[PDB]
Ligand binder design. Structure first.
Ligand code: MG
Length: 80
RNA sequence: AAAAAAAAAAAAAAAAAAAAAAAAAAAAAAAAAAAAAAAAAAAAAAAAAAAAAAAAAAAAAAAAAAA
């Protein structure tokens, strides 16, 4: 007879949005970069960001339609 | 002086009651009266009376991605 509770009722860390953390450390192709958030550009409600992920498939399948499991993907790249 | 054994094996034996013409009664309206194996012998399952079965449930997808 206990109730459930959400993390929206809680207090969440956000600073990983406001920094980078990566174990590659090469950080090359330094273009107009994956520029880090600060709290002047802190995220809001109702606001919009764009997002695009590129995928790769990792599964071998069978014929499956003829009158080893059906192929599914995984993520390869993300640009937000 | 018709005076018989007084019951094995749970023996064995009673009935717990009638046409009534007693008086001047014709010839089946019964509802059906109705026996044969035994030479290695007769042999339904499904669930069992259609006294009224309309019986295509629309379709159309121009095509993906994901640079
Ligand atoms: Mg596409």
């Amino acid at each position: 007879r206990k109730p459930f509770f959400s993390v929206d009722t809680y207090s969440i860390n956000y600073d990983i949005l406001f920094r980078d953390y990566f174990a590659n450390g090469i950080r090359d192709t330094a273009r107009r970069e994956y520029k880090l958030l600060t709290h002047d550009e802190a995220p809001k409600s109702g606001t919009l960001v764009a997002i695009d992920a590129e995928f790769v498939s990792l599964q071998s399948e069978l014929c499956e339609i003829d009158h080893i499991r059906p192929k599914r993907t995984a993520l390869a790249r993300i640009s937000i």
